[PDB]
Nucleic acid binder design. Structure first.
Ligand SMILES: [Zn+2]
Ligand SMILES: [Zn+2]
Ligand SMILES: [Zn+2]
Ligand SMILES: [Zn+2]
Lengths: 76, 78
DNA sequence: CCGAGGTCATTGACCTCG
DNA sequence: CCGAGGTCAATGACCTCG
């Protein structure tokens, strides 16, 4: 299967949606330490298996729009 | 933008004699200082991009070299 | 200014467990 | 296998010299 967020190879559904280790890892950390990001452009940055790390804001948002739901993330 | 000769990310300058990005600059520097030897777990012909660069250290180091990054300029004696 | 030589927070491949 | 949690070597953005 494929990560619905970046197109990288997925290996399960994590937090509700077919996602890759990276996107899952990223989503988890974002919630766990409750981080807020800011896009240096607009809010339509590419975010794929190659550029996903160019904008934390757009990556997270895309996590949200793809179905990744919080609540599925426990803590410490 | 400019382009890293290795992965196509944005180059930040010439590093060890080749136009490359911060990622490749650091990957090259670490690999050389430790004299690391990698083994491609794929077909030994990986094409580099921002995704593949993290996936194959051997093919990335070879590309680094092919593009002109100079190992001998990595922390030389003085 | 550039670029050599780090520093260190984030990334994501690899594990364990129920 | 699935999918929660966890780990930590590698990675790369940012920083300080020469
Ligand atoms: Zn992903
Ligand atoms: Zn953005
Ligand atoms: Zn590069
Ligand atoms: Zn390879």
């Amino acid at each position: 299967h494929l990560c619905s967020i970046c197109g990288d190879r997925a290996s399960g559904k994590h937090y509700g949606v077919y996602s890759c280790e990276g996107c899952k890892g990223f989503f988890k950390r974002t919630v766990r330490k409750d981080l807020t990001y800011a896009c240096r452009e607009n809010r339509n940055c590419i975010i794929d298996k190659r550029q996903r790390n160019r904008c934390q804001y757009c990556r997270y948002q895309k996590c949200l729009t793809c179905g990744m739901k919080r609540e599925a993330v426990q803590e410490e | 933008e400019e382009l890293c000769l290795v992965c196509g990310d944005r180059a930040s300058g010439y590093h060890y004699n080749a136009l490359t990005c911060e990622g490749c600059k650091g990957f090259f520097r670490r690999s050389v200082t430790k004299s690391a030897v990698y083994c491609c777990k794929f077909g030994r012909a990986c094409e580099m991009d921002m995704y593949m660069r993290r996936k194959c250290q051997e093919c990335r180091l070879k590309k680094c070299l092919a593009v002109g990054m100079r190992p001998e300029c990595v922390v030389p004696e003085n």
